[PDB]
């Protein structure tokens, strides 16, 4: 009977009755908590392992060690010593893998084709048994880590993240620098006689103890088979009894309370951070007092904190609630962005926060509020979307450290205890005497006197004046603040309509008129009471010029701003929407429980069509938008490279610069005039998909149409005005370079695009097979071996019905160097395709085949596939079977000549464009790089386009 290897098997693991997956919890003899998940339907299997150690446990003298260790586990073990055996195995079997390191966890996960779980899992287990920490792998990979940090140096959030740590108790582990870099991980340790390979060995051996591990494995196999699999590969992980680190002392003590920080940002942002130290509430998960308070302080409904701050013209957005620290400490935060007026009223903003908090004290804890949260969580759990395996295993592996086996599925959802004592206890901590205030603004530029070490952040620290504390300690009740009222959007009809006699497997065109094209599919898979309603509204006036594009955007920002109070309830109640301006007009998506969904939709369109602009709101949002256009200069070099390629290659695209300029001519009169004109003529293309009938779809569609007709007199657009934009057609054998400088970041970025031809069955699968075959090798060569940077990407580029192969890299090395390395790589690849076995070739076909045929696990993933088919106007709903049937037909030969025809350096149809984004500072061993021709340097985007042909558009299916 009893198994020596297993300490215990848990009881039934509580799950949604919608969840057909099966589950078994156990604890191994060496202390590993395990969840097993059997899903005989799944296409990919998955596992994850979470070690409850992370950077808070780094040696004080080697910042980043556990992060570095996390990179190093992938680079070879005693049992699979090839540096990239792991990632190549995954690649060849339709899988992928990643890992992350937080202060208390290191979390590793992969997925793979369901037939190769055991193979993937065996390779993975070795990470936790005997990594090699190869000496030469170590000297190389330390560059990946350094580059990971380089990218973050000039990110505002990362700097604030480390600044908070820099300003608490400096003796506290909380002040550690988790990322690491070349300095902390190589230079300084060399200076100090440290053998980093030994330190890695020591840290792994000391902390990667079985008692601190949780594993989750998801597979087609029975629960018994999964059980033996996990026993077999993980029993041997060794138990060293490591005590779980704990941090009962808060890193913010008294000398750190009532402090004000004035911080200089990189982007032009204006924000206020208010933070209070609290005890660790994790153990109170059955009541969740911190979520209760977040719900209330963070509310955006009538009566709310935000709603007053926004009326006063001081803030546009607010988040509040509990934020994690580590075992022993937490924080409660309330953060807002600041208008210009807001920037001068910080003191009053915070008084308001304290008045709102005093109101919660006065009314006392509210059982009815707790019930809503509880009901809404109960419903969210019952109808949760099936997760993608890799995310699911990863997530559960982390939380197995916090909840009994039997509750891991529900612990984060199901509320059980009403706890007015905890709610008051936490409320007693949200007091001016334990407050920390941080203001982020360019106005502090030059007025600061400190420098944070790791990021360079400039700031000032000041005692908040006792008198300001007092004024806050006496916050009176303010009549503008009320608790929210019953949330009427809470769904209660969950009936799944029976599948109609005329139901179809793909969307059907059930209406084709001048005004509107309606694609419809009743859900025949998921059976949750939800739906997705997507609409493209076409109008030439959304993008005719920069000015109109600015107006389209501001219109919609104003509209969302104006619906926000009303829409917030719907969103809490699992009904949300997304509304934005596109280069073709407008995009609207309403998703969630399909119960109350027509009410929200009808409200949106009605407000759209009878919209009245508040002037103060207009000015505020206009000023915010200007700044966001400027803030583009502080994006990363590789985002820049991607952006310019988009501008270069699309028929019509307005630059950020053009938009900025045109922005000053946006006046109130001008905007009021634009809206009716935009709405006067439209065509609507819709996908309605979910728990809805044909009749309800025609109904919803016509309702949108009628509302627009009634209030805005909309008429149909002419078929010819349904412009789609084309892609610049590159000449046989040309190479064009476009060069630019990133002014903020000290890295460069490049994007290289080898344009092939129009999309079609054969052309797509040539390009996809090739990308599949070169995919891990590019990563492995350009990053793991040559360490050109952290960001190294390769793959298909698809736009405007055209396609090709692209490379994106962000590096310290200059673009012209990057080019030559990619070119050298490309030659390695042709040779490699010649040299590979037939069977290696067929594995790649099979891996691409599995990737393409992976079934959607939830409604909105299936919707997205259809929506891609519609917005691209290819309407190829059965493309995966078609393209995969064709893929299976292909030979080495085909790919060799495809490459030779379209991709090789001397290819007769090479069509190459490169975007070079220079690092802030630049002024303008290895396989063999081919000689390259003189590029044509693009001097002006408009000229470049004028001088080239444009491709056709792709024909509909």
């Amino acid at each position: 009977m009893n198994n020596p290897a297993i300490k215990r098997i848990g009881n039934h693991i509580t799950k949604s009755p919608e969840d057909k997956r099966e589950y078994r919890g156990l604890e191994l003899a060496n202390g590993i908590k395990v969840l097993l998940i059997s899903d005989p339907t799944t296409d990919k299997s998955s596992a994850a392992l979470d070690v409850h150690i992370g950077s808070l446990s780094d040696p004080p003298n080697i910042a980043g060690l556990s992060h570095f260790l996390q990179h190093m586990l992938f680079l070879g073990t005693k049992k699979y010593p090839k540096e990239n055996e792991y990632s190549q195995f995954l690649s060849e079997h339709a899988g992928s893998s990643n890992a992350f390191t937080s202060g208390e966890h290191t979390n590793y996960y992969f997925d793979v084709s369901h037939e190769h779980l055991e193979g993937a899992l065996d390779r993975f287990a070795q990470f936790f048994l005997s990594p090699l920490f190869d000496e030469s792998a170590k000297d190389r990979e330390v560059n990946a880590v350094d580059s990971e940090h380089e990218k973050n140096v000039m990110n505002d959030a990362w700097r604030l993240f480390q600044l908070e740590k820099a300003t608490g108790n400096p003796k506290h582990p909380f002040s550690k620098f988790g990322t690491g870099n070349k300095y902390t991980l190589e230079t300084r340790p060399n200076q100090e006689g440290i053998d980093v390979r030994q330190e890695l060995l020591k840290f792994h051996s000391a902390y990667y103890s079985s008692n601190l591990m949780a594993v989750v494995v998801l597979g087609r196999e029975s629960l018994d088979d999964l059980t033996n699999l996990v026993v077999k590969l993980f029993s041997e992980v060794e138990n060293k009894n490591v005590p779980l680190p704990e941090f009962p002392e808060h890193p913010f003590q008294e000398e750190h309370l009532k402090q004000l920080y004035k911080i200089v940002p990189i982007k032009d942002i204006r924000n206020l951070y208010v933070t209070f130290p609290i005890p660790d509430l994790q153990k109170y998960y059955k009541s969740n007092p911190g979520h209760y308070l977040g719900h209330l302080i963070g509310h955006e409904g009538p009566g709310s904190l935000l709603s007053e701050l926004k009326s006063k013209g001081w803030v546009n957005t607010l988040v509040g609630g509990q934020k994690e620290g580590a075992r022993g400490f937490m924080f409660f935060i309330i953060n807002v962005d600041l208008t210009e007026e807001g920037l001068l009223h910080v003191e009053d903003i915070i008084l308001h926060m304290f008045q709102y908090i005093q109101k919660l004290r006065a009314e006392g804890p509210q059982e009815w509020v707790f019930q809503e949260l509880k009901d809404l969580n109960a419903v969210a759990f019952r109808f949760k979307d099936k997760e993608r395996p890799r995310g699911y295993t990863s997530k559960i592996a982390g939380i197995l450290h916090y909840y009994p086996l039997e509750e891991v599925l529900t612990a984060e959802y199901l509320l059980e205890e009403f706890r007015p004592d905890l709610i008051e206890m936490v409320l007693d901590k949200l007091r001016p005497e334990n407050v920390r205030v941080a203001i982020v603004s360019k106005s502090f530029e030059g007025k600061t006197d400190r420098t944070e070490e790791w990021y360079g952040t400039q700031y000032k620290q000041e005692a908040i004046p006792d008198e300001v504390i007092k004024k806050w300690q006496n916050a009176d009740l303010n009549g503008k603040f009320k608790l929210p009222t019953k949330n009427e959007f809470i769904p209660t009809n969950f009936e799944i309509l029976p599948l109609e006699k005329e139901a179809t497997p793909y969307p059907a065109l059930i209406k084709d008129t001048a005004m509107s094209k309606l694609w419809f599919k009743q859900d025949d898979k998921f059976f949750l009471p939800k739906a997705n309603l997507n609409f493209e509204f076409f109008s030439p006036f959304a993008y005719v010029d920069p000015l109109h594009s600015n107006m389209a955007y501001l219109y919609l920002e104003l509209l969302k701003d104006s619906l926000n109070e009303y829409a917030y309830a719907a969103e809490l109640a699992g009904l949300s929407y997304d509304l934005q301006n596109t280069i073709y007009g407008m995009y609207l998506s309403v998703k969630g429980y399909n119960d109350k969904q027509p009410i929200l939709l009808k409200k949106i369109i009605e407000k759209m069509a009878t919209f009245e602009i508040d002037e103060k709101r207009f000015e505020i949002i206009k000023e915010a938008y200007m700044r966001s256009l400027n803030n583009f200069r502080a994006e990363q070099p590789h985002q820049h490279a991607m952006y310019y390629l988009r501008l270069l290659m699309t028929e019509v695209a307005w630059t950020k610069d053009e938009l900025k300029e045109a922005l000053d001519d946006v006046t109130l009169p001008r905007l009021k005039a634009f809206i009716p004109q935009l709405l006067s003529r439209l065509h609507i293309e819709a996908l309605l998909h979910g728990n809805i009938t044909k009749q309800a779809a025609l109904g919803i569609m016509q309702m949108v149409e009628d509302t627009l007709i009634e209030h805005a007199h909309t008429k149909p657009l002419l078929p010819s005005q349904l412009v789609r934009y084309r892609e610049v057609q590159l000449p046989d054998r040309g190479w064009f370079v476009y060069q630019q400088r990133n002014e903020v970041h000290n890295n460069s970025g490049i994007e290289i695009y080898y344009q092939t031809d129009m999309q079609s069955t054969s052309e797509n699968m040539f390009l996809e097979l090739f990308a599949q075959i070169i995919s891990e090798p590019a990563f492995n060569t350009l990053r793991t071996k040559e360490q050109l940077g952290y960001i190294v990407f390769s793959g298909p580029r698809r736009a405007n019905g055209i396609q090709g192969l692209r490379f994106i890299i962000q590096s310290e090395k200059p673009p012209h160097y990057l080019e030559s390395r990619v070119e050298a790589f490309l030659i390695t690849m042709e040779k490699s395709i010649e040299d590979m076995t037939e069977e290696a070739f067929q594995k790649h076909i099979q891996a691409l085949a599995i990737r393409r045929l992976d079934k959607p696990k939830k409604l909105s993933a299936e919707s997205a596939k259809y929506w891609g088919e519609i917005i691209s106007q290819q309407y190829n709903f059965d493309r995966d079977n078609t393209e995969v049937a064709y893929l299976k037909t292909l030979t080495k030969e085909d790919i060799i000549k495809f490459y030779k025809e379209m991709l090789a350096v001397d290819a007769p149809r090479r069509h190459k464009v490169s975007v070079h984004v220079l690092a802030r500072e630049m002024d303008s061993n290895l396989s063999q790089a081919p000689a390259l021709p003189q590029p044509e340097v693009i001097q002006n985007m408009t000229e470049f386009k004028r001088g080239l042909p444009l491709f056709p558009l792709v024909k509909p299916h």
Binding site: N98, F100, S102, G103, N107, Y109, H291, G294, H295, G298, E300, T317, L318, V319, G320, G321, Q322, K323, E324, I333, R388, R390, G391, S394, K395
Partner: peptide
């Protein structure tokens, strides 16, 4: 707004990609 999943807790790259 209530602190997001990714705010209250530290997210994987995987969790971040879930929003795209």
């Amino acid at each position: 707004g209530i602190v997001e999943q990714c705010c209250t807790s530290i997210c994987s790259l995987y969790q971040l990609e879930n929003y795209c």
